[PDB]
Ligand binder design. Structure first.
Ligand code: HEM
Ligand code: HEM
Ligand SMILES: [Cl-]
Ligand SMILES: [Cl-]
Ligand code: NA
Ligand code: NA
Lengths: 713, 713
């Protein structure tokens, strides 16, 4: 059936902005997962899960009698898709159960793991999401085996369709680097925003880079991909060693015995895949990765045996029964238990990537400290596992249930508690009047608030105006934020805030985070007034101001807008067309196509462009809130041509006279080109639309201002 | 960026069921287009449109000084995509403005026509949809040029994204037959549901079949494709001759001069395409189809000259300036006006397909009658133009405005007006009690009402339970409808209705259409009682009974369910998998994926299957309304295998014992296989879900029962 994407494969795709509609959601429109979960008997769930660990099912028998290792692997894969570059991936939406993740080669036989959990999911129903359950199962695995976890938060609502993520351009699973769609270039530079070395892997290849079994070189890939998942070297060592304390790998026979992944399998498979023709196809005969490694003498108990073995033996290269490269301690004794035959023992074995923790010099320092001080290893692993499994959950205000850790971690971009009374409506009105009387302009006010609020991304729920991190390093110096202009605005606002707060009784005060957003609301209200309309923009107090010491500068770097179509800004020259980057940013802001369209055309006429560029400012009344962007963009009396100097900038000239009327970028002119976006622009460019435009702009503005306000959820 | 459709190109696609969400719609949730239209001053719009006809714009100058031909072509192409097989295409959604229709080769330069209309669209805003405006413009064109139309109805609400329609499998525009994805097989048999001879054409190729200029063979294609658009011979001749009374074709130079279609063009084209390098690119130099024909001596006025010329000359084959086949009148004087140069005249010309009207013997008799009796031609063309442009609008209750024709037409599947008091809630209770006391079972009652209601399709808004057409030819004999069982149900219900109606005062009576639906509601209520739930199903009276004379049997044939997964029914063996046919039917019923899911699982346990099949009846309490379908489908204690006799039937056996528990089809098992459908099934198969399942079932049931109830809109 030939489709529009077949005929016009490079047209812009807006369907990413209308995923997750009420149409695809089985739950009622009023369903609130937080309320369901808060009444779950979490202790009862955990008892069920503990019992499950040692209750083998014949269709996928448990190694050693215990599913703990499989479940820890399942939880780490759930979390292990996360990328800091964009925040996409991670455990927070339970996407392991949908395509394509459910059928990635690295996720083989995790379909069995998910299926073992159906009875428990069924029993508790809507009160526990899959997304929470995958993680909670990994925690119960660890606790059942003697490991003390750092805690657990619920609150990951389930989703109902695949997210649209760029996982790479390769058309072959696992393709080695250097091919026609290579994700590497230069000196082994992985393309942003990817965080895995091959399509279908989680971070790295367990045999070594493109299959070369060199621990030293494997360590370079580990370091790079874990950094792209926001983990430093201490965390990375703790996670790998901690995970490979438990369980085993599966590679009993040749890989050619393994059949179709779940999305390819027959309907009779009922959502499972990788059926194997090797012997019984399961249990002792299981094939998953093709490696056949068991790291420790007690695979079902926490220990410090991973590092005892790693340092205590010398290692030689060998092949598993499937032909993969792996390492064995020859002339160790046969001290490692077999998974199913109590009369068989095995020598210690290791992956290439495990040996990286010893042979990379920076890793070896850390591994040696963890070997000599296994309580330090256990604390680091507990901390890193909580980070791994909660990194995309957003502000601590989202965390639910009785096991939330009290300690506030730097990586959570923490917001101080508010311990004072909040401003009321009359106070908000007084501050809005003060702001407008200071001389700050509509453009200054809207641009500052937009800069503060628009760092939010729904992928990982990081960013937004709460915290007033605009005023701190590094956001105060991001080029998109116009650092000198911003500094002058913030000085003026801080003086207003100091005056107001000095005049109060009773402990009432306004934060700078709330004032930045309230000042942007005053800009919007004044722009509506400039156009002849009286509107009140909604405002919700309660943001707090974070300190510099509460702000990790390096982790904040990935939130820098290097393309922000809403401010007609491109930090440099990218391969991806600017209009594609605009839709990406709209998706991160959680905007639909209509909301993106109204928002952009309003920002243009309010003066939100970086550098006060005239591109897209299709109005003769700048700083008034009107639909002039749309009316002027859609006027057929204007003819548009790319400039000689820059093919991405366009001049709009009167068709009859040739007189120059406007300039625009691709981001501006796509709204007059793309057949769906132009249908939207037409609505807002119609003669009956001025009221609609103002109402819808104010609504979307308020939506952006409140993205991170899970304290009000 | 590699997508799930790249990896798994034959996985079932559910996004068709969640198009048209509130997310992509710019209008607020409560917007009601009928209410907006009803307050439009349609007379003012029509004055503006008459003014536009001779307001030539320099970027696409009007032929003869009058855009009327261009606009009639625009309206006929709007409507001309309709297919009776599925109801998809047509004018009623304004899909011409979106991909792919906006960029079909046969729609070349209609982007100009639509852009001429923007000022009028802009002026009236939301009170006139594009979909209504395209048709209204065509009517005004005709009226401007001297032809009195039959009438016009508004009410076509705009849509905001492309509909998902199968337009063919070819990967080359215009591909001639017999390619790897040929739409023809056999003795020129066009594949259902297609109604065009080549990808990107409307009905037929104006040069002849696959480009061969044989008028007689052309006529076979005309007849077949027009019939697939619901037109008979009289209507087809009236339409073609009527259309080609106006305007001209455009083929002034080689087609190699014409550039990218709109979806391919540069952003600076601002939504237009087919830019031509031939001379001025427009007006006298225009290139659209490549043909250069002007049919009549007065191309801007209604006349009887089409048939005068067709019969009055003999025709010679020639080539246009672009090299397309066309015909010129032998020995004729230069009597046809030029479009731009008053000093030039041209000989009469015709397309191959125009000569079909003379050289096909059935057409010739009609053509000759219209030539001799031009009042008959004029009435036929007015009637056909109204049918062409309204065939997909649905029941007359949807027709809005002051120009609706009063005459009721057979093709409208007319429903008689209700002229008596309707039953009230007390009466509905009394009739549900009578139904349950007759002995009719849950299975009988649900199956009959489902058979009556599920003929509805949202594509053209045909079908549904109003009318009680289930009791007429041909629906009473459709295999899916179980004719002998149905006749016994209808006899029992007709006796109940006769007894009730005989006992009334004051003119009160119940229709059989209402009683069928109310009897199905009673069956649902009884099934809920069987399962221990106290449920009242909503019911809205007001349906009327249509007569046999009001029911065109041939036109009803396209509404026969040859696949209805809701009743586990397939009439024969098709190429398309049965689960794909299910999603198609759910799309016609306007169901989302959750609604499809809940409705199937309920119908299975209520006994709706055709032939009382046990396939998918995953319950030990048939005729009770429970979520058993889902709980038993998802039980991992059951293993599924395809049968030896039939690979599309599956046996479910106890995994431990081997005992046979259930059988099922692909439609049943896809809910356990497809990762998005299985997620939905899980919600309804959870321990907390029985009440949710019942409530959601009753809601979707009532939805289906009410699909055609535009009298209540
Ligand atoms: C360099 C990063 C890593 C590599 C390349 C890697 C590689 C793999 C491979 C190839 C398997 C075998 C799959 C099978 O054949 O069954 C696996 C198993 C496992 N991994 Fe990792 N791993 C990585 C990091 C992690 C981390 C961060 C954790 C968790 C904290 C983890 C926990 C596990 C567990 C528990 C198993 C055993 C599964 C079982 O018993 O069924 N791994 N590892
Ligand atoms: C067998 C069915 C038909 C065929 C193959 C056909 C073919 C075409 C073609 C090839 C053009 C020339 C396009 C261009 O070069 O500008 C055209 C023009 C046009 N057709 Fe048809 N036609 C069909 C039926 C219809 C019908 C049913 C109507 C309307 C009732 C219609 C009304 C028009 C009008 C008014 C024009 C002139 C456009 C102008 O003045 O710009 N045609 N036809
Ligand atoms: Cl994601
Ligand atoms: Cl359609
Ligand atoms: Na994410
Ligand atoms: Na349709």
């Amino acid at each position: 059936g030939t489709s529009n994407r077949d005929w016009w494969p490079n047209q812009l795709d807006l369907s990413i902005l209308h995923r997750h509609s009420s149409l695809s959601d089985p739950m009622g429109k009023d369903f609130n997962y937080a309320q369901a979960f808060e009444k779950l008997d979490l202790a009862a769930v955990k008892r069920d899960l503990h019992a499950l660990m040692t209750t083998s099912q014949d269709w996928w028998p448990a190694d050693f009698g215990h599913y703990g290792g499989l479940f820890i692997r399942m939880a780490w894969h759930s979390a292990g898709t996360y990328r800091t570059a964009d925040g996409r991936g991670g455990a927070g939406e339970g996407q392991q159960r949908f395509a394509p993740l459910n059928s990635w080669p690295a996720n083989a036989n995790l379909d069995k793991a998910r299926r073992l959990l159906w009875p428990i999911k069924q029993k508790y129903g809507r009160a526990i999401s899959w997304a929470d359950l995958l993680i909670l199962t990994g925690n119960v695995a660890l606790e059942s085996m003697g490991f003390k976890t750092f805690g657990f938060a619920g609150g990951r609502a389930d989703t109902w369709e695949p997210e649209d993520v760029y996982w790479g351009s390769e058309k072959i699973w696992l393709e080695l680097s250097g091919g026609p769609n290579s994700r590497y270039s230069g000196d082994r530079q992985l393309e942003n925003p990817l965080a895995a070395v091959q399509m279908g892997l989680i971070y790295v290849n367990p045999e070594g880079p493109d299959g070369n079994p060199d621990p030293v070189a494997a360590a370079r890939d580990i370091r790079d991909t874990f950094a792209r998942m926001a983990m430093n070297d201490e965390e990375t060592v703790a996670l790998i060693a901690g995970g490979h304390t438990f369980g085993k790998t599966h590679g009993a026979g040749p890989a050619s015995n393994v059949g179709a992944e779940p999305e390819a399998a027959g309907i009779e498979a009922q959502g499972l895949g990788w059926k194997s023709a090797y012997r019984t196809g399961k249990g002792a005969d299981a094939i998953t990765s093709g490696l056949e490694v068991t790291w420790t003498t007690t695979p079902t108990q926490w220990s410090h045996n991973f590092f005892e073995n790693l340092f205590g033996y010398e290692w030689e290269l060998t092949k598993s029964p499937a032909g993969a490269h792996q390492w064995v301690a020859k002339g160790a004794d046969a001290v490692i238990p077999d998974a199913f035959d109590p009369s068989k023992k095995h020598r210690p074995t290791m992956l290439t990537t495990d040996l990286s923790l010893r042979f990379d010099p920076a890793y070896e320092k850390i591994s040696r400290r963890f070997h000599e001080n296994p309580e330090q290893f256990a604390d680091a692993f507990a901390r890193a596992w909580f980070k791994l499994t909660h990194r995309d959950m957003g502000p601590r205000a989202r965390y639910l249930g009785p096991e939330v850790p009290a300690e506030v971690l730097l990586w959570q971009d923490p917001i101080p508690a508010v311990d004072h009374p909040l401003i009321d409506a009359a106070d908000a009105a007084e501050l809005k009047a003060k702001v407008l009387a200071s001389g700050l302009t509509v453009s200054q006010l809207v641009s500052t608030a937009w800069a503060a609020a628009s760092t939010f991304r729904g992928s990982d729920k990081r960013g937004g105006a709460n915290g007033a991190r605009i005023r701190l390093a590094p956001q105060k110096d991001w080029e998109a934020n116009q650092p000198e202009q911003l500094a002058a605005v913030l000085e003026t606002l801080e003086a207003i805030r100091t005056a107001f707060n000095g005049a109060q009784r009773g402990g009432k005060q306004v934060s700078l985070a709330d004032l930045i957003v309230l000042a942007g609301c005053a800009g919007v209200e004044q722009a509506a007034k400039n156009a002849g309309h009286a509107v009140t923009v909604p405002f919700a107090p309660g943001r707090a101001d974070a300190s510099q010491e509460q702000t990790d500068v390096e982790s904040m770097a990935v939130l820098e807008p290097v393309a922000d179509g809403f401010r007609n800004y491109l930090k440099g020259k990218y391969r991806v067309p600017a209009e594609v980057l605009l839709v990406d940013k709209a998706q991160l802001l959680t905007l639909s196509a209509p909301e993106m369209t109204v928002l952009l055309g309003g920002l243009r006429v309010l003066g939100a462009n970086v550098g006060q560029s005239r591109h897209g400012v299709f109005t003769a009344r700048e700083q008034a809130l009107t639909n002039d962007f749309f009316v002027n963009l859609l006027d057929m009396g204007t003819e548009w041509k790319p400039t000689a100097a820059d093919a991405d900038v366009f001049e709009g000239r009167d068709r009859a006279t040739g007189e120059l009327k406007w300039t625009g970028t691709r981001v501006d002119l796509v709204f007059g080109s793309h057949s769906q976006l132009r249908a939207l622009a037409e609505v807002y460019g119609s003669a009956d639309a001025q009221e609609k435009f103002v109402r819808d702009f104010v609504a979307v503005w308020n939506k952006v201002m409140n993205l991170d306000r899970f304290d009000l959820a």
